[PDB]
């Protein structure tokens with residue numbers, strides 16, 4: 001099964017780390033926890049922002065063009081990407097925007113962090129029809145000394 005994971009601001013805006021104005025260790029801990037030991041698929045731009053392979057995870061980069069780093073697995077198509085994951089129970093799609101869009105229709109679960117922040121951005125997470133998804137977990141957190149803004153973690157499953 002394919003699952004998408006992402007941190008959304010108001011308006012479904014998403015953006016790279018440095019582009020994002022919040023500092024949320026709790027959300028990074030959640031991302032870590034839900035992706036560990038699973039293969040992760042990301043776009044080139046995401047790969048470049050991350051800087052190094054995420055440890056304990058098979059890193060697959062979807063890109064039309066040739067790879068430039070032997071530490072990760074380069075694939076050229078969405079099908080190729082799934083094939084490279086092998087026989088695993090859950091594949092995590094970590095963005096960015098275009099990658100999310102390509103995998104949404106194949107996805108069965110979404111792990112979302114809704115951050116209470118207004119920020120400008122080009123990029124938005126794909127529109128998904130709420131009636132087509134069921135919320136199975138939600139949990140609100142206020143901001144604190146460590147965490148810049150308030151957030152709500154949510155897990156949705158395709159009905």
Ligand SMILES: Nc1nc(=O)c2c([nH]1)NCC(CNc1ccc(C(=O)N[C@@H](CCC(=O)O)C(=O)O)cc1)=N2
Nearest residue numbers: 011012112114115116138139140141151152153154
């Ligand atoms: N687009 C979108 N934006 C959001 O802000 C959003 C969303 N989707 N998805 C999930 C979500 C979760 N937000 C929230 C907000 C408040 C509580 C909350 O008050 N929880 C209390 C229960 C209080 C009551 O029923 O009075 C709790 O402690 O569980 C939980 C989740 N927020």
Ligand SMILES: [Cl-]
Nearest residue numbers: 043045046096
């Ligand atoms: Cl990307």
Ligand SMILES: [Mn+2]
Nearest residue numbers: 068069070071
């Ligand atoms: Mn070499």
